[PDB]
Design a protein around this ligand. Structure first.
Ligand SMILES: NC(=O)C1=CN([C@@H]2O[C@H](COP(=O)(O)OP(=O)(O)OC[C@H]3O[C@@H](n4cnc5c(N)ncnc54)[C@H](O)[C@@H]3O)[C@@H](O)[C@H]2O)C=CC1
Ligand SMILES: NC(=O)C1=CN([C@@H]2O[C@H](COP(=O)(O)OP(=O)(O)OC[C@H]3O[C@@H](n4cnc5c(N)ncnc54)[C@H](O)[C@@H]3O)[C@@H](O)[C@H]2O)C=CC1
Lengths: 331, 335
C-alpha cells in the first residue's frame, strides 16, 4: 500500500522543493507515495498550481495527492510528516515574535497529529524555531510519544560537512563523525573535534589537520551564520538545501544509518543521555539509527571544555525559549 | 573525468530547480559533474547564494561549480547546455512577445557555444519562445550543426501524458506513444491518435477509450493552455515541472530512449522528414534516440486530416516567428 507523507507549508519555497523530490521517489524509492499537502487558505490557489505541476511531472511513484487547508484531512493516516509551514518572517521581525506567532500553529498541529495521524508517525519539524516548535507539538500530542518527534539540525550538519570538506580539500564522502549540538540557532555547536578524514591508508583526526583557533572560531561562526548569509545573498530562503537536509534526516530516521555514520538530530532529551543535558527540551545530539528506525545517542565522546561551555549555553537558550513558549500558550 | 554542464539563468526559478537535481546525480548517475552557472550581473549576488546552497547539500557527484557572468568562462569546454536564461511571460502574454526581449540572448549564446563549447555540445533551449530561440542560436553557431541543437517540448509532452492518464484513469506509466508536434506555443499539436493504454485486460488504443471530439478538442486546448494555467495559479513559473522535463529531454537525448518509447523533441527540420514539414525551422516531432545519442523521427505514422491541418498551422506559425525574429534582430542591430 502507498505511504502517506504530509508536507505543511506546501506552497512555500521549502515545501515546493520537497514535494517534487518525494513525489518522484527520492524518499521511499520504488514504494508509491500519497502526498498530503497542507496550506493556509490564502495559499490554496498557489497550492493547486503546485498540484498541477506534480501531475505534469508524470512520476509513477506518485499514487495520489491530497491538497487541503483542513488539518483533519491533511493529517489523516499520515506515516511521515514534514512540518515546514510557519508564519513568515516579515522585515524587522525578531526571533522572539516569530516564536510567539508559531507557538499556536504547532499546538494545533501537535493535536492534529495525535488525533488523526498513525501512532507510528515520524514527525520532522523544519519550521523555525525548530527545536521549540517541536517541543510544543509533542507537548500537545498525548496519543504520541518522544519517539515520534524530532527537529532538523541536519542542514547545520550538512553545512558543516560541506565546509570542512572544502577546508580539507577532500570530497564530502571522506568526512566522518561531524556533530552539531543543541539548538537550531546561532547558539548551535558545530563540533568537529570527533571528526575524521580519509587518507591513503586510514583515517586522520580533523583536529590533527587543522588548528584549534579555526575549528573553534571561524568555522563555528561560519556555520552558525550560514542561514543568514544565504538569505542575504538570494533574498530568499535556503529552499533546496533545506529540502535536501529534511530528506536526508527522514531517510536516515526511517531506514537507519550505516555503521560508523553519525547524524545530528534534535530529539527529546532522555534522562540517561551521557552528556548531562537536562530532560525537558529538544536538543541536537550525534545519533545513529538502527534498522528498526530507533534513534540512539552516540555515547563515549570526550567533551572538551570549549564544547562543554557551548553545549551549556545552547541548553540555556533552549530552556529560555521553552519558558517563553509556555507563557504565550498559557493565554 | 567529470562532465561539464552549463545552466544559464541559474539564479532564476527553472535554473535553480535544475541545478540541484543535476548536482545530486539525477542526469549522469554516478558520474561526476562540474556545473557551469551563467547569470547577468544583477543576479550574481543571488547566484553566489545558490552556490552556497549547492555546497550545503554535500552531494558527492558535484565535482565543481563555476559561477560567472562572462559567457567565455561559462561556455568553455561545456558538454551539455541548458539555455534557460531568458525573460519569462507574466502574468499572461504570448511567448512571441518575449521574442523582442530574448532573441538577442540566443544570438550571443549561439556564437559563444560555437567558439567556446566543445563541438560535440548538446544544447537544449528552454527559454521562450523556445523553437525560435533555438533557431537563432543555431544560425549563429557556424562551427556547430543541427545535431547540437533542440528546443523543449518535453513539458508539453509530459503534461499530455499526465492529463490523458488522469482522463483514462490509469497510472502514467501505462500510457505510451504520445506526441506533441510543432511549436512550443498555442499551436502545439497534442496528438494521442497513436497512443496506447495498458489496462489489466490488455493494451488498447486511446482513440478506442475516449471520443474523437474530446481528443481533438477539450484535451488539446487543456494542454495548449496549461503553461498559462499554472502561471496563473502559482503566480510564478512552472519551475520544478519544467526542470523535470528538461532533465527528461536531456537524459533521453544523451543515453537514448527505451524500446517502444517516443519522446517529443523540437529539432531542426531535416530534408526529407516523413511529414512534409519544410526545412528552416525547429519543429517538434515524435522521436526515438539510440545509444549513440542520435535522434530519429518516427516514420510511417498515419496522419489524420485533423492532425495534418494542425501540423500545417503550427508550421505556418513557426515560419512567421522566424521572419519576425530576424526582423527584430535586424532592428536591434541597427538601433
Ligand atoms: N531547520 C532548518 O534548517 C530550516 C528551517 N527553515 C524554516 O522553514 C520554514 C519555512 O521556510 P520557507 O519554506 O522558506 O517559507 P515560505 O514562507 O516560503 O513558506 C511557508 C509556507 O507555510 C505556510 N503556512 C503558514 N501557516 C501555516 C499553517 N498553520 N499550516 C500550514 N501551512 C502554513 C504559508 O502559507 C507558506 O506557503 C521557516 O520557518 C524557516 O525559518 C528554513 C530553512 C532551514
Ligand atoms: N520550454 C518550456 O516548456 C518552458 C520555458 N520556460 C521559459 O524559461 C525561461 C526562464 O523561466 P524562469 O526560470 O521561470 O525565469 P526567471 O525570471 O525566474 O529566471 C530567468 C533568469 O535568466 C537570467 N538571464 C536573463 N538574461 C540572461 C543571459 N543573457 N544570460 C544568462 N542568464 C540570463 C535572469 O537573470 C534570471 O535569473 C523563460 O523564458 C520561460 O518562458 C519556462 C517554463 C517551461
Amino acid at each position: 500500500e502507498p505511504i502517506h507523507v504530509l508536507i505543511t507549508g506546501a506552497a512555500g519555497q521549502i515545501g515546493y522543493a520537497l514535494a517534487f523530490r518525494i513525489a518522484k521517489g527520492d524518499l521511499f524509492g520504488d514504494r508509491k507515495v500519497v502526498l498530503h499537502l497542507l496550506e493556509i487558505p490564502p495559499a490554496m490557489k498557489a497550492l493547486e498550481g503546485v498540484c498541477m505541476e506534480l501531475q505534469d511531472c508524470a512520476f509513477p511513484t506518485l499514487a495520489g495527492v491530497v491538497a487541503t487547508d483542513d488539518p483533519e484531512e491533511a493529517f489523516k493516516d499520515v506515516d511521515v510528516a514534514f512540518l515546514v509551514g510557519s508564519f513568515p518572517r516579515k522585515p524587522g521581525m525578531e526571533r522572539a515574535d516569530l516564536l510567539e506567532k508559531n507557538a499556536g500553529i504547532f499546538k494545533v498541529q501537535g493535536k492534529a497529529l495525535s488525533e488523526y495521524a498513525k501512532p507510528t508517525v515520524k514527525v520532522l519539524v523544519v519550521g523555525n524555531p525548530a527545536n521549540t516548535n517541536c517541543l510544543i507539538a509533542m507537548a500537545n500530542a498525548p496519543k504520541l510519544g518522544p519517539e515520534n518527534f524530532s527537529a532538523m539540525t541536519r542542514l547545520d550538519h550538512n553545512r558543516a560537512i560541506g565546509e570542512i570538506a572544502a577546508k580539507l580539500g577532500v570530497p564530502v564522502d571522506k568526512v566522518h563523525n561531524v556533530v552539531v549540538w543543541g539548538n537550531h540557532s546561532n547558539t548551535q555547536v558545530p563540533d568537529v573535534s570527533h571528526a575524521t578524514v580519509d587518507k591513503e591508508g586510514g583515517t586522520k583526526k580533523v583536529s590533527d589537520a587543522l588548528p584549534k583557533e579555526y575549528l573553534e572560531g571561524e568555522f563555528v561562526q561560519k556555520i552558525a551564520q550560514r542561514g543568514g548569509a544565504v538569505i542575504e545573498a538570494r533574498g530568499a530562503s535556503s529552499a533546496a538545501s533545506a529540502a535536501n537536509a529534511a530528506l536526508c534526516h527522514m531517510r536516515d530516521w526511517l531506514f537507519g544509518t550505516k555503521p560508523g555514520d553519525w547524524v545530528s538530530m534534535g530529539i527529546p532529551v532522555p534522562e540517561g543521555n551521557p552528556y548531562g543535558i537536562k530532560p525537558g527540551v529538544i536538543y541536537s545530539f550525534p545519533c545513529t539509527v538502527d534498522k528498526d528506525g530507533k534513534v540512539h545517542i552516540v555515547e563515549g565522546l570526550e567533551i572538551n571544555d570549549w564544547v562543554r561551555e557551548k553545549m551549556e549555553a545552547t541548553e540555556k537558550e533552549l530552556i529560555e525559549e521553552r519558558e517563553t513558549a509556555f507563557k504565550v500558550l498559557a493565554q
